[PDB]
Every structure is written in structure tokens, then in C-alpha cells.
PDB file of C-alpha atoms and ligand atoms in Angstrom:
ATOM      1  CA  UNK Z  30      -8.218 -22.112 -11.468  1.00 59.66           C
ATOM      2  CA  UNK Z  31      -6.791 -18.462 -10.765  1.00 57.34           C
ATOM      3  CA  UNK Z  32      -8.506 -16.498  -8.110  1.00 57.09           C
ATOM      4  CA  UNK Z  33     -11.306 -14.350  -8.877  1.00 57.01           C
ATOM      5  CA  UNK Z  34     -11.454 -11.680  -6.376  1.00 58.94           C
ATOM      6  CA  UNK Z  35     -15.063  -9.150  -6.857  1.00 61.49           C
ATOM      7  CA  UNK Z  36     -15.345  -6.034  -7.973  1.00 64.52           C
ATOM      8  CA  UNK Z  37     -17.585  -2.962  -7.864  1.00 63.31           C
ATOM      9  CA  UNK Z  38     -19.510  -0.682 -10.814  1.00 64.32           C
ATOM     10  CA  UNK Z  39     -19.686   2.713 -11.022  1.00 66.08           C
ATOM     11  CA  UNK Z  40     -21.208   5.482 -13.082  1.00 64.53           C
ATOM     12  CA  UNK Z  41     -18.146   7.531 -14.651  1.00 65.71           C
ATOM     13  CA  UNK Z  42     -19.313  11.120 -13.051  1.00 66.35           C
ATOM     14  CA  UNK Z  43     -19.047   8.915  -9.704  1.00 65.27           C
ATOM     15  CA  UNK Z  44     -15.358   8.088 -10.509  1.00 63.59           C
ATOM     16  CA  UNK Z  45     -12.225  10.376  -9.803  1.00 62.32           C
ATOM     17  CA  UNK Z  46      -8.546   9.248 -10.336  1.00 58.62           C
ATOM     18  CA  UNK Z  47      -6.394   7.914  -8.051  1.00 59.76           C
ATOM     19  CA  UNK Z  48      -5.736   6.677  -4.352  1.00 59.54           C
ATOM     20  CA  UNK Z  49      -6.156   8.228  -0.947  1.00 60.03           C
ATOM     21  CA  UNK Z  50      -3.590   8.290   1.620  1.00 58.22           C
ATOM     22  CA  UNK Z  51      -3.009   8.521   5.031  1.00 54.39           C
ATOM     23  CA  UNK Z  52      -0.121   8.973   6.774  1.00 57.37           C
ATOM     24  CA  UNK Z  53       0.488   8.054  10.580  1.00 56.77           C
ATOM     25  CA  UNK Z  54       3.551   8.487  12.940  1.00 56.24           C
ATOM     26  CA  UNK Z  55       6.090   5.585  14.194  1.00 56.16           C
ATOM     27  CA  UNK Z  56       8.258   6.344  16.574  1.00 58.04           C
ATOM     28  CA  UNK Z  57      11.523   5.092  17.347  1.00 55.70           C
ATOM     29  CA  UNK Z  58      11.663   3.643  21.434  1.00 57.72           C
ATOM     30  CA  UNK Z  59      14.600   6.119  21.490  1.00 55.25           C
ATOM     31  CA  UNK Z  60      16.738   8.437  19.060  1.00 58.97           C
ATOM     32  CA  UNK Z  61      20.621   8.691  19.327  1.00 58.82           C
ATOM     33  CA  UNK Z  93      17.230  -1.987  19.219  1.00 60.34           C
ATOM     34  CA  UNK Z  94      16.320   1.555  18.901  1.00 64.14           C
ATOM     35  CA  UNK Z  95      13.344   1.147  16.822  1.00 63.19           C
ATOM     36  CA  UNK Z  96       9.789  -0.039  17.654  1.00 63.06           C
ATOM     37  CA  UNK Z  97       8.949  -3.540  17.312  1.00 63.35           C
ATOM     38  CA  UNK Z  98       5.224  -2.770  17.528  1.00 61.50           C
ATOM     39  CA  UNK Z  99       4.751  -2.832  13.543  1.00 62.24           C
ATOM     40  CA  UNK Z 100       5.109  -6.281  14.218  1.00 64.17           C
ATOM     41  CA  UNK Z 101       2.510  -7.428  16.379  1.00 66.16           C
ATOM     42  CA  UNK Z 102      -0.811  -8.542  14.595  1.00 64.80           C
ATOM     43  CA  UNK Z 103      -2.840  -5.837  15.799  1.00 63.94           C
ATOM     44  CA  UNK Z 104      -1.068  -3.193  14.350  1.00 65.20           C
ATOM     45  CA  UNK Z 105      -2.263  -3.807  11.085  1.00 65.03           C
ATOM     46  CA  UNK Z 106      -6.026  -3.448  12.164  1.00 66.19           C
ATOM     47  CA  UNK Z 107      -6.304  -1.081  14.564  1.00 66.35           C
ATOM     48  CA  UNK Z 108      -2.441   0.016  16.342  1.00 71.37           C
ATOM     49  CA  UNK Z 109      -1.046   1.928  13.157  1.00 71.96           C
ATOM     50  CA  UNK Z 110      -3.184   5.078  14.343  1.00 70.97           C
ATOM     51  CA  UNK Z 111      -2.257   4.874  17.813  1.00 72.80           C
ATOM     52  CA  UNK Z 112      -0.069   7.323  17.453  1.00 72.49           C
ATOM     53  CA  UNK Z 113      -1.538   9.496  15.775  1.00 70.92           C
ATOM     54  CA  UNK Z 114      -1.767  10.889  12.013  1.00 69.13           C
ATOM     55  CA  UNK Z 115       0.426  13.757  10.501  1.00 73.23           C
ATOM     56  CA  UNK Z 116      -0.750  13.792   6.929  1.00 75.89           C
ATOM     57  CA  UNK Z 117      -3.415  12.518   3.916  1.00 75.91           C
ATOM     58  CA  UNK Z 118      -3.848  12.966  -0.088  1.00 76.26           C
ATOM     59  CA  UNK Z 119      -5.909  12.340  -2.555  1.00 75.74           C
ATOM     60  CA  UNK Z 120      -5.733  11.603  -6.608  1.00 76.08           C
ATOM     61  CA  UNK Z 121      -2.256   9.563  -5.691  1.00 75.37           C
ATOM     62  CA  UNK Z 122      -1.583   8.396  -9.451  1.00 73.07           C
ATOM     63  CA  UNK Z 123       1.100   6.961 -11.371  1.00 73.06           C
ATOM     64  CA  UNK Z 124       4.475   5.932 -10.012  1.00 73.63           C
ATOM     65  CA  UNK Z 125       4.084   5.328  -6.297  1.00 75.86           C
ATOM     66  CA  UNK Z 126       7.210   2.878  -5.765  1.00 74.57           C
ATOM     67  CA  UNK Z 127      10.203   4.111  -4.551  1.00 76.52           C
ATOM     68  CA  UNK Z 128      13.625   2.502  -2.934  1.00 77.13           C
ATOM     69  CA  UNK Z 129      15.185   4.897  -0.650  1.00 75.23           C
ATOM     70  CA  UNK Z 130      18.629   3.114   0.171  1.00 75.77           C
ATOM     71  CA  UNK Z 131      20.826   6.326   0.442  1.00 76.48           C
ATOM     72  CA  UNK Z 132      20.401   7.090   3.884  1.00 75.67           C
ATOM     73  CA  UNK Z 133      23.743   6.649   5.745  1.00 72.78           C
ATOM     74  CA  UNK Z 134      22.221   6.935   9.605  1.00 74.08           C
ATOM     75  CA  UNK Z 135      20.349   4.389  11.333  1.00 73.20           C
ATOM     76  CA  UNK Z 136      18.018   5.213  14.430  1.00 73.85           C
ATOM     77  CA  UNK Z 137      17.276   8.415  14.066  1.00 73.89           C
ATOM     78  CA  UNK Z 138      14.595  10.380  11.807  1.00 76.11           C
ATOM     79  CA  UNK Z 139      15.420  11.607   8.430  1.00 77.39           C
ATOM     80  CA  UNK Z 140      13.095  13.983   6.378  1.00 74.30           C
ATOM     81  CA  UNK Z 141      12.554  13.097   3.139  1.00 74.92           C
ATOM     82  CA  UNK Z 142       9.760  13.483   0.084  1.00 72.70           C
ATOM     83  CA  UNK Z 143       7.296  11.395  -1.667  1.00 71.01           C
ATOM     84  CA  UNK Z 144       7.441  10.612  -5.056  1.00 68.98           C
ATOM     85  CA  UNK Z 145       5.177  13.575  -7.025  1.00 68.00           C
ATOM     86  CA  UNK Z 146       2.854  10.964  -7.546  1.00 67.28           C
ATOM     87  CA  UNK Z 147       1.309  11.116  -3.828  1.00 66.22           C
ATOM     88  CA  UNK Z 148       0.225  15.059  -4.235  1.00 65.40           C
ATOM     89  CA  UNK Z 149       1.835  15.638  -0.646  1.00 65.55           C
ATOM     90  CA  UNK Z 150       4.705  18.114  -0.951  1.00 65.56           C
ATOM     91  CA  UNK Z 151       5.952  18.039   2.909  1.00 67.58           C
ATOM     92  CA  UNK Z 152       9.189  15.840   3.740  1.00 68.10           C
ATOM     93  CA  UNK Z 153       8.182  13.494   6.077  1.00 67.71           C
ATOM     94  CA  UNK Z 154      10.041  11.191   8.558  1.00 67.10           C
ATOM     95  CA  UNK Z 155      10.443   8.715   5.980  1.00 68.91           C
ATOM     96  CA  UNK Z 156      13.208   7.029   8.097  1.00 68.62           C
ATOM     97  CA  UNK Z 157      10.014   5.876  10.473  1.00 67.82           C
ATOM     98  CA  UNK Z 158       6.235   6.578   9.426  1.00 69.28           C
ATOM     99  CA  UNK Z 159       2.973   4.277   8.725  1.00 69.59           C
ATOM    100  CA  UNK Z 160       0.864   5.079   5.370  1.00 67.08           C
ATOM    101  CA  UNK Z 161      -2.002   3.381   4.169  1.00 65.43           C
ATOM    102  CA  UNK Z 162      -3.688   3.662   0.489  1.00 67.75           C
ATOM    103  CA  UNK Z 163      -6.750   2.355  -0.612  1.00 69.42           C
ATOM    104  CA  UNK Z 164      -9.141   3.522  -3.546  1.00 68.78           C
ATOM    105  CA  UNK Z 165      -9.695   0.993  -6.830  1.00 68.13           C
ATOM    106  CA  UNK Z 166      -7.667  -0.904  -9.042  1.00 65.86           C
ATOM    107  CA  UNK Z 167      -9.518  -1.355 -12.859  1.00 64.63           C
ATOM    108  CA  UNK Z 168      -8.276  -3.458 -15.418  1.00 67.96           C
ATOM    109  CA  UNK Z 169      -7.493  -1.937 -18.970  1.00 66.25           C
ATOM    110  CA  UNK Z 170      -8.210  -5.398 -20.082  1.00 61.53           C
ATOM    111  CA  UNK Z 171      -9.721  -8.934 -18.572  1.00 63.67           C
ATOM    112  CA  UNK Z 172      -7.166 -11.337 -17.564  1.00 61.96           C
ATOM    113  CA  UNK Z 173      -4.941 -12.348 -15.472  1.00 63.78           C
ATOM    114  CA  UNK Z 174      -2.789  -9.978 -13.384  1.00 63.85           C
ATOM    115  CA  UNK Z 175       0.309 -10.799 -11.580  1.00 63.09           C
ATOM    116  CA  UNK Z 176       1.107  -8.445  -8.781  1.00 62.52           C
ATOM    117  CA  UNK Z 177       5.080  -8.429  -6.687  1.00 59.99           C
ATOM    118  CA  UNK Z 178       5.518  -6.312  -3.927  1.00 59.29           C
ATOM    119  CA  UNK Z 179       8.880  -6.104  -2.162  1.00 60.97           C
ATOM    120  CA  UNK Z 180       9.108  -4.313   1.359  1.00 60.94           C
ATOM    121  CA  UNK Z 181      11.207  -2.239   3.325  1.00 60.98           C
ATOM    122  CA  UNK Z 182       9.979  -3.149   6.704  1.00 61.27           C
ATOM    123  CA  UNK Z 183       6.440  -4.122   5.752  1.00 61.78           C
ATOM    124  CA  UNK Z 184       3.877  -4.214   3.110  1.00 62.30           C
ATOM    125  CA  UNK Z 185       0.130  -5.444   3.348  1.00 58.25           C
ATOM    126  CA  UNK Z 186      -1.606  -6.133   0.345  1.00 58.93           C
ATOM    127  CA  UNK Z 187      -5.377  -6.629   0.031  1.00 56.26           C
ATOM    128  CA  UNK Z 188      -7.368  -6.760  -2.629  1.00 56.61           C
ATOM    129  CA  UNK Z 189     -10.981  -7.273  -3.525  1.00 56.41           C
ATOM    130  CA  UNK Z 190     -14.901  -6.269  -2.124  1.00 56.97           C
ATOM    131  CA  UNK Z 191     -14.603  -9.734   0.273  1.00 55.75           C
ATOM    132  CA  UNK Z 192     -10.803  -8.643   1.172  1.00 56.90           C
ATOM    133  CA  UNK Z 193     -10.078  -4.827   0.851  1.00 55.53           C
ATOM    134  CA  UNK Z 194     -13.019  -3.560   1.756  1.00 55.00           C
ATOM    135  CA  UNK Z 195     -16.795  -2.620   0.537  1.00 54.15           C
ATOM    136  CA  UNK Z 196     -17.439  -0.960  -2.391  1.00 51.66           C
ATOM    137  CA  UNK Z 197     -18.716   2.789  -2.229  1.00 53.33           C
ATOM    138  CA  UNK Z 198     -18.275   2.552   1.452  1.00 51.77           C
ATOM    139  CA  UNK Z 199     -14.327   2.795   1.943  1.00 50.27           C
ATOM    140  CA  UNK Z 200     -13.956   5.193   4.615  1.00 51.71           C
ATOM    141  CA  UNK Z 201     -16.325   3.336   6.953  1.00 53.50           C
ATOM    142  CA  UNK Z 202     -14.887  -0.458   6.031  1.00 49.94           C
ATOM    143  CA  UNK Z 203     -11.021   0.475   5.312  1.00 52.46           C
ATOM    144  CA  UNK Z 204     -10.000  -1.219   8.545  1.00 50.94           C
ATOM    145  CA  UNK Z 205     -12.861  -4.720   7.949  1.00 53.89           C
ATOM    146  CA  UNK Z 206      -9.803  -6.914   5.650  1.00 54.47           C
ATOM    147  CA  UNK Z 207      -9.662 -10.105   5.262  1.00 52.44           C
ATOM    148  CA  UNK Z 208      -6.702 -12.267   5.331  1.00 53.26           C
ATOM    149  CA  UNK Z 209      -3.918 -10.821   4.022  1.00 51.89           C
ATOM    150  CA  UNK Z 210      -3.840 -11.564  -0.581  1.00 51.28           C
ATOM    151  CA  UNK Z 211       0.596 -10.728   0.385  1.00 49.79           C
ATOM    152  CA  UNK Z 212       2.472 -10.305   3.114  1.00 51.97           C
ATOM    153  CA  UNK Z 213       5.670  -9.102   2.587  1.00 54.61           C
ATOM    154  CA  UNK Z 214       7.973  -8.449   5.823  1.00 53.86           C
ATOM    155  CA  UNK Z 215      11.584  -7.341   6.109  1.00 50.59           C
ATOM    156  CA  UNK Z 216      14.600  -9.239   6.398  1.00 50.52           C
ATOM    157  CA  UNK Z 217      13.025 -12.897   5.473  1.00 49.99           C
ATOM    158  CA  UNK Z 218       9.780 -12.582   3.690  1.00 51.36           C
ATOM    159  CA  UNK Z 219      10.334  -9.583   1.681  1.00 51.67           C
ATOM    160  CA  UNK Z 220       9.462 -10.177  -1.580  1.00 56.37           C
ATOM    161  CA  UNK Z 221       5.834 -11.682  -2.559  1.00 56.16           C
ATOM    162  CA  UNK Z 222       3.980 -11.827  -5.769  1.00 56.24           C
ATOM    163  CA  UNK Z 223       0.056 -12.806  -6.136  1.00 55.05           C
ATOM    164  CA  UNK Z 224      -1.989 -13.910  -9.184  1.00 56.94           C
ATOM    165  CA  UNK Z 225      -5.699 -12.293  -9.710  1.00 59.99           C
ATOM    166  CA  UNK Z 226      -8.360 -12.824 -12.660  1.00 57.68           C
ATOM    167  CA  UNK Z 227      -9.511  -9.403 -13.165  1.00 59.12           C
ATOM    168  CA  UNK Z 228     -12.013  -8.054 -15.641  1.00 59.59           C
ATOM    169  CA  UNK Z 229     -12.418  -4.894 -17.626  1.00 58.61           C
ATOM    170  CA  UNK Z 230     -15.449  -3.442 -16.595  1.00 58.62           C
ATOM    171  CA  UNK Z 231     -14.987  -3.551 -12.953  1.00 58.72           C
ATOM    172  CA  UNK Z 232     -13.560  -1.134 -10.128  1.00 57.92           C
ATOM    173  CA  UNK Z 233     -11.539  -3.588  -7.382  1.00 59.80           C
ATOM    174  CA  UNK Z 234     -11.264  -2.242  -3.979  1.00 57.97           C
ATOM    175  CA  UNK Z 235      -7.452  -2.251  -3.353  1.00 55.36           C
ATOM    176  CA  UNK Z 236      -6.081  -1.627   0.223  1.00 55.12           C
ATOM    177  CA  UNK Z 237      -1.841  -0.937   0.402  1.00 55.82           C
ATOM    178  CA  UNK Z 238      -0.507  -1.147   3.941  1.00 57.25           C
ATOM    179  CA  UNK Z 239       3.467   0.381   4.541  1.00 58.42           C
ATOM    180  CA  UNK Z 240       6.026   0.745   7.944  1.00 54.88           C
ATOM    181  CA  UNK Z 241       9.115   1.991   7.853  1.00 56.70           C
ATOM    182  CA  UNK Z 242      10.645   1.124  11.404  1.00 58.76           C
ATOM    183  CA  UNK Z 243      14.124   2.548  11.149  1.00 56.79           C
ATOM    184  CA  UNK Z 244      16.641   3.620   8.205  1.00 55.61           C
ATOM    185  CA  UNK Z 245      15.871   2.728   4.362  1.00 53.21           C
ATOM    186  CA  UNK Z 246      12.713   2.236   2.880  1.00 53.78           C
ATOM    187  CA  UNK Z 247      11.249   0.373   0.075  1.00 55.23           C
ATOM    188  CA  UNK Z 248       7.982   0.450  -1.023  1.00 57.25           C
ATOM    189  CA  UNK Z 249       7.481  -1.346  -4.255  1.00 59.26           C
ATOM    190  CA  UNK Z 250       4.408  -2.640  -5.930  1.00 60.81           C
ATOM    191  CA  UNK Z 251       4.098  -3.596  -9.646  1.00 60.46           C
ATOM    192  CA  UNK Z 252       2.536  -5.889 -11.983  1.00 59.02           C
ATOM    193  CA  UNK Z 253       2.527  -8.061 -14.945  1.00 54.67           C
ATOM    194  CA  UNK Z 254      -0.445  -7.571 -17.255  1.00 54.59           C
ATOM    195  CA  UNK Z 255      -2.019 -10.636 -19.218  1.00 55.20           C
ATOM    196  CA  UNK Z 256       0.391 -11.627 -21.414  1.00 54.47           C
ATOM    197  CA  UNK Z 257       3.219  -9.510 -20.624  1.00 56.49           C
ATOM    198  CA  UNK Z 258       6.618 -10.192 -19.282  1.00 56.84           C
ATOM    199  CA  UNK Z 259       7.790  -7.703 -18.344  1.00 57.03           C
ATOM    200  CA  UNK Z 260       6.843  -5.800 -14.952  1.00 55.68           C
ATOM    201  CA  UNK Z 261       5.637  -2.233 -14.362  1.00 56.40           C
ATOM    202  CA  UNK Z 262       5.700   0.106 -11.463  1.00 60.33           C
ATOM    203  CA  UNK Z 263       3.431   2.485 -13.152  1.00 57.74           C
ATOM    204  CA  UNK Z 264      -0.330   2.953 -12.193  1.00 56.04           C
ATOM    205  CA  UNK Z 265      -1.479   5.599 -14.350  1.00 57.53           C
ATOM    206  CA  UNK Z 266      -4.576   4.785 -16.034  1.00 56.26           C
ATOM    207  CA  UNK Z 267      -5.146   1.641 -13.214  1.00 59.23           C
ATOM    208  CA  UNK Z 268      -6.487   3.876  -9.767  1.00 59.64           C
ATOM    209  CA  UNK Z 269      -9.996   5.575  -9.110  1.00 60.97           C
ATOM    210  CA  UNK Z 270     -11.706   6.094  -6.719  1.00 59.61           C
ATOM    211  CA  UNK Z 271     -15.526   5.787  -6.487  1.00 60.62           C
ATOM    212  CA  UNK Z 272     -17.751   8.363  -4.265  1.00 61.85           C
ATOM    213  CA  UNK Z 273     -18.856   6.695  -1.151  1.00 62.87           C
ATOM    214  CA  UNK Z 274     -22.344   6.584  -0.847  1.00 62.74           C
ATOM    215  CA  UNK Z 275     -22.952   2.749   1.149  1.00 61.98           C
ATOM    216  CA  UNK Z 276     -24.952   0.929  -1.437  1.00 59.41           C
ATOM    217  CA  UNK Z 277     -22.580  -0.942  -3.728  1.00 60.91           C
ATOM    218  CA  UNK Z 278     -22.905   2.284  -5.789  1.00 63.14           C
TER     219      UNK Z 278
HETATM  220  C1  LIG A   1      19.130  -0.415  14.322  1.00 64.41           C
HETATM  221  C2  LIG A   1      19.791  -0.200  12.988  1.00 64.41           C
HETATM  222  O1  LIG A   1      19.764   0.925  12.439  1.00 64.41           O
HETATM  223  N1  LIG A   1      20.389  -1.269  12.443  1.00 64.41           N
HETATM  224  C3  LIG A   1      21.089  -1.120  11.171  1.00 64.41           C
HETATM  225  C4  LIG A   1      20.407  -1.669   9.906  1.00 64.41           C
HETATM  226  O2  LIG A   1      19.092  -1.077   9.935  1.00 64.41           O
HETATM  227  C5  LIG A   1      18.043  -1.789   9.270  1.00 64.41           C
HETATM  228  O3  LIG A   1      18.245  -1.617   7.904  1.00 64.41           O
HETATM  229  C6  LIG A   1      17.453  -2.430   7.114  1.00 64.41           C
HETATM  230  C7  LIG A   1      18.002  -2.287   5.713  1.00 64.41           C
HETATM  231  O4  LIG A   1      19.211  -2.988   5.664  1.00 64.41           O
HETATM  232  C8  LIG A   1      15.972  -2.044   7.270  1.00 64.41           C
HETATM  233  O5  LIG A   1      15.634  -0.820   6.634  1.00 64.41           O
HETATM  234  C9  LIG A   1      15.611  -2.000   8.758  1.00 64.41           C
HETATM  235  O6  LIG A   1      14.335  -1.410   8.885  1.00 64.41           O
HETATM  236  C10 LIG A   1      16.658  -1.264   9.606  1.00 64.41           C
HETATM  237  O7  LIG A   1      16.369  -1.406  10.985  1.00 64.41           O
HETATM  238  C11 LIG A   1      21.314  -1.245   8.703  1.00 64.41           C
HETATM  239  O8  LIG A   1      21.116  -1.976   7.501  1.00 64.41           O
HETATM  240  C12 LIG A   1      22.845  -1.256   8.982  1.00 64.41           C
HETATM  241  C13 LIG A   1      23.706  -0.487   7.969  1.00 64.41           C
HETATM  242  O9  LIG A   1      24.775   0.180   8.630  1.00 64.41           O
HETATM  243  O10 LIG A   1      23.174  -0.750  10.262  1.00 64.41           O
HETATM  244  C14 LIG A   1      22.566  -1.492  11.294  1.00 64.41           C
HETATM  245  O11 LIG A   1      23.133  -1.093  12.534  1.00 64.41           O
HETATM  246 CA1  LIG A   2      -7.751  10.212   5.357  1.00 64.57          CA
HETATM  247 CA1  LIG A   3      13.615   0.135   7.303  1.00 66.43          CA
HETATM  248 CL1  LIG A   4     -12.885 -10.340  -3.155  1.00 65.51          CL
END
């Protein structure tokens, strides 16, 4: 069958919409390869994205968090540019060269089964689950204890993935979104396929919560 991932329950006056976020710097090696190769060494993921430290963080991030930022006309050097309004952060960042991760919980409007298709511009890490993403009502602490990747999605040659998950109503699923830009345009697009729909959405509203961390499954 489908995979099954677990979930987590959760009083409502323990819930609050939407994702956190954190965002961390990337540096270019040099500004006018000139860009940083580091993204891609396996360690990055777990513990090198911080290494250079973080600029920014939100909360409540709801809605439409894709975006495809292909109008930038220089390569290898930084170019300021803002979030969609979904990610309640209202500086420009260096969105030519940045790390961001968001985690929080996806929930179901109905049981079934959920396609998911990320496609990346440079990199996207998708996890998903209490045995993937990380523990339930204890997200701060575990964000950085995932499992083996549910999609890996990596710029030029493995860019676009999709994933299939059997996901029910009742339950809160820690989720756990990993994104580099390394240099230049940027794409950062997740969506999904509800049961027994065709066609694809890149809108979360209604999907993201997050649960109050208090260690004990809640
Ligand atoms: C180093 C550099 O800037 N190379 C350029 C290409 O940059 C890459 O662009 C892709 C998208 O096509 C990715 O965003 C990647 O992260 C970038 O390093 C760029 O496409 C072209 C367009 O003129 O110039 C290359 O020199
Ligand atoms: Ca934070
Ligand atoms: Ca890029
Ligand atoms: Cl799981």
C-alpha cells in the first residue's frame, strides 16, 4: 500500500495557524564558480545551514508560500528581494543567496491520499511525519533529528519530485521544508493534489498549524 506517515493530536486552544521560519545566510565564495558549493555537502542539511549565522524568523506563515523568482538578470552577486505576504516577514532579503527552513503541521481537511510535488531552485528538503520531521509538541528541540529525506529535489538534474502520503483528518503531521538559494533565481515550489483531485494547488490556507510545544506528544 501507500505510506502512512504518523501524526500528532492536539487540543484546539493548543493550536495556532501556520508555519515558523527561519532564515540563515549563504554566502557567495566571492561577489563581482562564484557561489558556495557547501549547500551541497550532506551535512549541511543537519547541522551546516546555521553556520553562518541567522538574519531573520516568522511565525503564522499561511497560505501561498511558493514563488518562482526568474527575473533576475545578474548572476553572482546578491539581490534584495521580498517574500511572498504569506511569510509575515516584510524585510527584502538576499534572496539571490539565503537558507530558510519551515516546519510546523500539515492537517488534512479530509482522509486520503495526498500527493505532494516540489520543484527547486537550488534545493528543497522535504520531510514529513512524527518518525521523519520531527516529534510532536517538541519541534524546537527535535527540528534538526530527520529521518531520511520523504523528497529530495536538487537543481539542475533532480529538480522536480513528487511523494504520495495516506493522511487522515483528525491528525496534526509534523512537516519540515528545507530551501538554498546558491546564486541567481530561485524557486521554491511546493503543492499538492488532494484525494481525488487533479488538479494541483500551491495554496496552504486552511492546511498549517502549529501545536504549542510542551514535550509530551501533547
Ligand atoms: C555562476 C552563475 O551565475 N552562472 C549562471 C547561471 O546561474 C545559475 O542559474 C540557475 C538557473 O538557471 C540556478 O539558479 C543556479 O543556482 C545559478 O547558479 C545562469 O542561469 C546563467 C544565465 O545567464 O548565467 C550563468 O553564468
Ligand atoms: Ca526560529
Ligand atoms: Ca539559484
Ligand atoms: Cl512518520
Amino acid at each position: 500500500h501507500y505510506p502512512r506517515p504518523e501524526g500528532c493530536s492536539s487540543p484546539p486552544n493548543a493550536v495556532s495557524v501556520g508555519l515558523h521560519m527561519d532564515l540563515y545566510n549563504y554566502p557567495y565564495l566571492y561577489v563581482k564558480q562564484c557561489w558556495n558549493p557547501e549547500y551541497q555537502d550532506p551535512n549541511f542539511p543537519r547541522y551546516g545551514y546555521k553556520k553562518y549565522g541567522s538574519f531573520g524568523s516568522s511565525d503564522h506563515v499561511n497560505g501561498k508560500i511558493s514563488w518562482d523568482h526568474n527575473e533576475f538578470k545578474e548572476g553572482c552577486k546578491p539581490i534584495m528581494a521580498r517574500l511572498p505576504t504569506a511569510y509575515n516577514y516584510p524585510a527584502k532579503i538576499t534572496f539571490s543567496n539565503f537558507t530558510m527552513v519551515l516546519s510546523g503541521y500539515f492537517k488534512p481537511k479530509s482522509t486520503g491520499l495526498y500527493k505532494f510535488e516540489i520543484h527547486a531552485d537550488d534545493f528543497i528538503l522535504f520531510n514529513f511525519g512524527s518518525k521523519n520531521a520531527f516529534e510532536c509538541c517538541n519541534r524546537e528541540e527535535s527540528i534538526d533529528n530527520f529521518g531520511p529525506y520523504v523528497a529530495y529535489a536538487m537543481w539542475p538534474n533532480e529538480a522536480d519530485q513528487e511523494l504520495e502520503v495516506y493522511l487522515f483528518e483528525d491528525s496534526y503531521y509534523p512537516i519540515r521544508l528545507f530551501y538554498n538559494n546558491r546564486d541567481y533565481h530561485s524557486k521554491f515550489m511546493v503543492g499538492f493534489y488532494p484525494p481525488n483531485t487533479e488538479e494541483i494547488t500551491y495554496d496552504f490556507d486552511g492546511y498549517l498549524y502549529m501545536l504549542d510545544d510542551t514535550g509530551n506528544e501533547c
